[PDB]
Amino acid sequence: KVFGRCELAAAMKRHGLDNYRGYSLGNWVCAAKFESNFNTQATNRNTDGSTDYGILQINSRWWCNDGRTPGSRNLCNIPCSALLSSDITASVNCAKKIVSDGNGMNAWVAWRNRCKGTDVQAWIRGCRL
Ligand SMILES: [Cl-]
Ligand SMILES: [Cl-]
Ligand SMILES: [Cl-]
Ligand SMILES: [Cl-]
Ligand SMILES: [Cl-]
Ligand SMILES: [Cl-]
Ligand SMILES: [Cl-]
Ligand code: NA
Numbered sequence: 001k002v003f004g005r006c007e008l009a010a011a012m013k014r015h016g017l018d019n020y021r022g023y024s025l026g027n028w029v030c031a032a033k034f035e036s037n038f039n040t041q042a043t044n045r046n047t048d049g050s051t052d053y054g055i056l057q058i059n060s061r062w063w064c065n066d067g068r069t070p071g072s073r074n075l076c077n078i079p080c081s082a083l084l085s086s087d088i089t090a091s092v093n094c095a096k097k098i099v100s101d102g103n104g105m106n107a108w109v110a111w112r113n114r115c116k117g118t119d120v121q122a123w124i125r126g127c128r129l
Helices: 005-014 025-036 080-084 089-099 109-114 120-124
Strands: 043-045 051-053
Touching: 005 025, 005 120, 025 109, 025 120, 051 080, 080 089
Parallel strands: none
Antiparallel strands: 043 051
């Protein structure tokens, strides 16, 4: 599913990400924009042989199981495929564990490089929330 900007903001809010670990909704919408362009079915293979899954490009090295990432963990306890669902619950539940891990939203490299420090509230401007 390719979410609209405001549609994803609302879903993220409903799923408890708004100010989760102090990160405002615009931060999460911005990270989803640049990670996946709002497409839940986004996948991208990394050089280390792990793969990034879903709206927030959650990686199989630590977070989910895809069966093809040697030495990897599955700390979200989910198949990586659950991260591609039109329903974002699995992705949000996993992102909450990731943003809790110590480095906050820096764990999403596109967030650090493209969202961090910017006017992230722009990402929710206009939206009925
Ligand atoms: Cl957009
Ligand atoms: Cl915001
Ligand atoms: Cl594996
Ligand atoms: Cl494969
Ligand atoms: Cl594990
Ligand atoms: Cl699995
Ligand atoms: Cl933090
Ligand atoms: Na894994």
